[PDB]
Protein backbone atom coordinates (compact mmCIF):
# COMPACT_ATOMS: atom_id res chain seq x y z
CA UNK A 1 0.00 0.00 0.00
CA UNK A 2 1.05 3.81 0.89
CA UNK A 3 3.68 4.36 3.77
CA UNK A 4 4.27 7.41 5.28
CA UNK A 5 7.60 6.27 7.96
CA UNK A 6 8.54 9.74 9.98
CA UNK A 7 12.25 9.36 11.60
CA UNK A 8 14.83 12.23 13.42
CA UNK A 9 13.12 12.59 16.41
CA UNK A 10 14.25 12.41 19.79
CA UNK A 11 14.81 14.18 23.28
CA UNK A 12 16.80 17.24 22.91
CA UNK A 13 17.83 20.82 24.99
CA UNK A 14 16.06 24.11 24.43
CA UNK A 15 18.03 26.25 21.85
CA UNK A 16 18.90 22.57 19.91
CA UNK A 17 18.21 21.28 16.36
CA UNK A 18 16.73 18.64 14.99
CA UNK A 19 15.84 17.46 11.64
CA UNK A 20 12.92 15.12 11.03
CA UNK A 21 12.40 13.35 7.45
CA UNK A 22 9.18 11.64 6.11
CA UNK A 23 10.06 8.97 3.66
CA UNK A 24 7.32 7.99 1.09
CA UNK A 25 6.22 4.16 -0.11
CA UNK A 26 4.13 4.12 -3.09
CA UNK A 27 3.62 7.52 -3.27
CA UNK A 28 5.75 10.51 -5.21
CA UNK A 29 5.99 13.42 -3.08
CA UNK A 30 6.86 15.80 -5.50
CA UNK A 31 3.44 16.01 -6.94
CA UNK A 32 0.80 16.65 -4.27
CA UNK A 33 0.57 18.57 -1.23
CA UNK A 34 2.42 17.31 1.91
CA UNK A 35 2.66 18.38 5.36
CA UNK A 36 3.42 18.15 9.10
CA UNK A 37 1.15 18.96 12.07
CA UNK A 38 2.00 18.35 15.39
CA UNK A 39 -0.34 17.36 18.86
CA UNK A 40 0.75 18.45 21.97
CA UNK A 41 -0.06 16.56 25.08
CA UNK A 42 -3.40 18.01 26.60
CA UNK A 43 -3.81 19.92 23.74
CA UNK A 44 -5.48 19.88 19.86
CA UNK A 45 -3.46 18.68 16.88
CA UNK A 46 -2.08 21.97 14.98
CA UNK A 47 -0.78 22.68 11.49
CA UNK A 48 2.92 23.56 11.18
CA UNK A 49 3.71 23.40 7.66
CA UNK A 50 2.96 22.21 3.88
CA UNK A 51 4.78 21.73 0.65
CA UNK A 52 3.72 21.85 -2.88
CA UNK A 53 6.67 21.52 -5.26
CA UNK A 54 8.55 25.23 -5.25
CA UNK A 55 5.80 26.39 -2.32
CA UNK A 56 5.83 26.50 0.91
CA UNK A 57 3.54 27.36 3.95
CA UNK A 58 4.51 27.66 8.14
CA UNK A 59 2.28 27.91 10.95
CA UNK A 60 2.69 31.19 12.68
CA UNK A 61 4.32 29.99 15.66
CA UNK A 62 7.28 28.44 13.96
CA UNK A 63 7.88 30.64 10.58
CA UNK A 64 11.36 31.81 10.44
CA UNK A 65 12.38 28.44 12.48
CA UNK A 66 11.45 25.58 10.84
CA UNK A 67 11.86 24.98 6.64
CA UNK A 68 10.04 22.38 5.41
CA UNK A 69 11.91 20.87 2.17
CA UNK A 70 12.00 17.91 -0.23
CA UNK A 71 14.33 15.42 -2.21
CA UNK A 72 12.64 13.88 -4.78
CA UNK A 73 15.46 11.65 -5.57
CA UNK A 74 14.76 10.01 -2.05
CA UNK A 75 11.18 10.65 -1.95
CA UNK A 76 11.77 12.00 1.09
CA UNK A 77 10.12 15.20 2.91
CA UNK A 78 12.12 16.98 5.51
CA UNK A 79 11.42 19.07 8.52
CA UNK A 80 14.58 21.31 9.46
CA UNK A 81 13.89 22.57 13.09
CA UNK A 82 15.88 25.25 14.57
CA UNK A 83 15.90 27.06 17.90
CA UNK A 84 13.47 24.86 19.72
CA UNK A 85 11.78 25.68 22.79
CA UNK A 86 9.94 23.10 25.59
CA UNK A 87 6.48 24.57 23.54
CA UNK A 88 7.90 22.80 20.30
CA UNK A 89 7.46 19.28 22.14
CA UNK A 90 4.60 17.17 21.14
CA UNK A 91 4.21 14.18 18.28
CA UNK A 92 5.20 15.14 14.66
CA UNK A 93 3.01 13.69 12.21
CA UNK A 94 3.73 13.02 8.50
CA UNK A 95 0.57 13.61 5.79
CA UNK A 96 -0.05 13.48 2.26
CA UNK A 97 -2.85 14.72 0.27
CA UNK A 98 -4.27 13.53 -2.76
CA UNK A 99 -4.11 17.04 -3.98
CA UNK A 100 -2.13 19.08 -6.06
CA UNK A 101 -3.96 22.72 -5.35
CA UNK A 102 -1.39 25.49 -3.48
CA UNK A 103 -4.34 27.42 -2.90
CA UNK A 104 -5.66 24.22 -0.77
CA UNK A 105 -2.23 23.25 0.33
CA UNK A 106 -2.09 27.00 1.68
CA UNK A 107 -4.73 26.37 4.38
CA UNK A 108 -1.99 24.18 5.63
CA UNK A 109 -4.63 21.65 7.64
CA UNK A 110 -2.23 18.51 7.28
CA UNK A 111 -4.57 16.52 9.62
CA UNK A 112 -7.44 16.34 6.55
CA UNK A 113 -4.58 14.80 4.25
CA UNK A 114 -5.76 11.12 2.98
CA UNK A 115 -2.44 9.45 4.27
CA UNK A 116 -0.73 10.05 8.01
CA UNK A 117 2.26 8.49 9.00
CA UNK A 118 2.62 7.17 12.60
CA UNK A 119 4.55 10.20 13.97
CA UNK A 120 7.50 10.96 16.00
CA UNK A 121 8.30 11.82 19.58
CA UNK A 122 10.03 15.73 19.64
CA UNK A 123 10.82 16.41 23.19
CA UNK A 124 12.66 19.31 24.32
CA UNK A 125 13.49 20.22 27.43
CA UNK A 126 14.42 23.30 29.12
Known amino acids: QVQLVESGGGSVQAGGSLRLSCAAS????????MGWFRQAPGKEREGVAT??????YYGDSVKGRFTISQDNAKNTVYLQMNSLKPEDTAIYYC?????????????????????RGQGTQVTVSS
Open 26 to 33: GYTVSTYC
Open 51 to 56: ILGGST
Open 95 to 115: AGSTVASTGWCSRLRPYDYHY
